[PDB]
């Protein structure tokens with residue numbers, strides 16, 4: 266019906282310390298389950314999960330987003346759009362059991378933040394307060410982007426998430442992480458060499474590698490390099506469009522700028538649709554396990 270307002274409500278009696286403990290649990294499990302996906306680890310899929318769940322948001326009616334933490338995935342993950350995400354949810358289940366008080370939305374988004382930081386990425390301010398909304402679920406059907414599209418599609422798509430050119434290019438840098446799996450999305454191959462280390466490699470590879478457009482074993486077109494890397498048509502569109510290209514070059518030449526811009530864009534993504542009271546706690550900046558000597 267009429268647009269609904271989602272006000273962040275801090276989990277009763279919880280403070281920064283409580284959430285750092287959750288972060289630590291996630292970070293410790295990331296370290297422990299090192300063999301997942303041929304030793305890439307769960308970091309990438311957790312970042313994907315955080316993006317996907319938040320990416321369901323629609324600025325027009327404030328439906329979807331990370332707030333409710335309640336979704337209905339098309340074909341129960343047996344669709345090229347969401348196949349693989351169940352791995353992230355399975356990873357987080359034990360965490361939710363250890364900390365039953367945290368909301369699902371807070372857990373899903375915190376998983377993404379934790380993964381980025383533990384993989385040596387930028388610190389990402391994170392705010393608690395998402396409230397589970399069972400009875401009000403968001404189906405992912407047709408809400409996330411297709412990979413077989415061009416720059417115009419990408420630009421238009423992200424306008425629904427209230428993201429501009431710089432925000433879009435910065436967010437896509439997350440593809441430095443993990444890889445596409447043929448059986449999941451119909452695409453196969455990593456975007457770079459350091460699959461579980463957050464860097465600006467995505468942009469360097471786009472600009473420096475020799476790419477060739479060809480069909481994969483699923484008959485889908487993707488760009489492949491002699492180094493064994495790949496780029497989705499949507500990734501490659503970032504260097505075909507002149508406006509996107511300039512930004513790709515900027516991030517390829519300034520690691521710090523990319524980190525700062527990604528940090529802002531990612532927090533924004535995870536917070537879309539959420540209203541934070543003026544007297545709400547300041548954003549939390551969690552310490553990595555390394556910083557805590559853990």
Ligand code: ZEM
Nearest residue numbers: 309310313316349410411412436439443444445446449450
């Ligand atoms: C144009 C927009 C996008 C499209 C079309 C798109 C996309 O089609 C796909 C596809 C097909 C896969 C491969 C799935 C598979 O086979 O397992 C995949 C995997 C991952 N992504 Zn991705 N992505 C967009 C935006 C963003 C944004 C924004 C992200 C976060 C900031 C972020 C993070 C991650 C990550 C980390 C992965 C790797 C997951 C893994 O399991 O390795 N993405 N992404």
